[PDB]
Amino acid sequence: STSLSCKQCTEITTKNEIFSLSLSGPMAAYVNPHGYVHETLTVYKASNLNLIGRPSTEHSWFPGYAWTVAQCKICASHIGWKFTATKKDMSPQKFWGLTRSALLPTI
C-alpha cells in the first residue's frame, strides 16, 4: 500500500498501518499546550524514526498513553510521537501519532 515519507528528505509508514485509536477517526486535529495544532494520524507501526527524550504523559492526547518525540533518522525533521501504554490492560500497547504536515504525499 501507499508509503508515507518524510516530507523534508525515507518511508515512515504505509496506509495499511492506519487505524483509529479513538472514535475521532484515524486523523484528527489536536492542540498542544502552546497553541500548535497537530493533525495527528495514528498508525500501528512506523519505520526510520529516532526518539528524543523520555516518555511523558503531560498533555497526552490519548489518555493512558505516554508520548516520546519522534524524528526522521535521516534529516532529524520532527515527524510525530511514539505512544506507549502506561498500563498492561490497554490495546494496542504502542502506536505512533504522525503529524500530517511532516509527511508526503499530502493527506
Partner: peptide
C-alpha cells in the same frame, strides 16, 4: 534531565545548542 524545550512538539534537550538546531528544522 532535559530543560530546553520545543513548544511546537515537546522535544527536550540537555544542550541549548541542540534545541537551536531542532528549532531550525521546524523551518
Amino acid at each position: 534531565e532535559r530543560p530546553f524545550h520545543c513548544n511546537q512538539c515537546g522535544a527536550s534537550f540537555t544542550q541549548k545548542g541542540n534545541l537551536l538546531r531542532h528549532i531550525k528544522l521546524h523551518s
